[PDB]
């Protein structure tokens, strides 16, 4: 019966703090398919090379 | 708090013998807390 202005905005203020208890809410990876017998570049657990 | 661990099939009951055997990284604890003293706690007339 009141207005949408009063209708609650379901609010999640993402309070996050940095550089303590080492970074744990993190960014994922996107994979590919394996290739063989081809001079290519690669990335494995941070390790990168060709 | 890295936990290097290993069980080797010794066959004796008393003071550590000679011989060679490595350990293995069994589990790490990705905490960042401060620790400087420990205490044993057994399975406690």
How would you classify the helix and strand content of chain A by structural class? mainly beta
Q: What is the number of strand segments of chain A?
A: 2
Main sheet attributes: strand count, strand direction, barrel closure of chain A: 2 strands, antiparallel
Oligomer: part of a larger assembly
Note the overall shape of chain A: elongated
Question: Roughly how many Å apart are the termini of chain A?
Answer: 65 Å
Count of runs of 4 or more consecutive helical residues of chain A: 0
**Fraction of helical residues of chain A:** under 10%
* Chain pair with largest interface: A-B, 4 and 3 residues
Strands of the widest sheet of chain A, in order across it, are 1-2
Percent of residues in beta strands of chain A: 5-15%
The whole-angstrom Rg of chain A is 22 Å
Order of helices and strands of chain A: EE
PDB class: viral protein
Keywords: SARS-CoV-2, cryo-EM, viral protein
Entry title: SARS-CoV-2 spike protein in one-RBD open state
Chains A, B: Spike glycoprotein
């Amino acid at each position: 019966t009141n207005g949408v202005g009063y209708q609650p905005y379901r609010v999640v203020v993402l309070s996050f703090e940095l550089l303590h208890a080492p970074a744990t809410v993190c960014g994922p990876k996107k994979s590919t398919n394996l290739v063989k017998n081809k001079c290519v570049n690669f990335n494995f657990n941070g390790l990168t090379g060709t | 708090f890295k936990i290097y661990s290993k069980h080797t099939p010794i066959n004796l009951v008393r003071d550590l013998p000679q011989g060679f055997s490595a350990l293995e990284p069994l589990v790490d604890l990705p905490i960042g807390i401060n620790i400087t003293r420990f205490q044993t706690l057994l399975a406690l007339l």
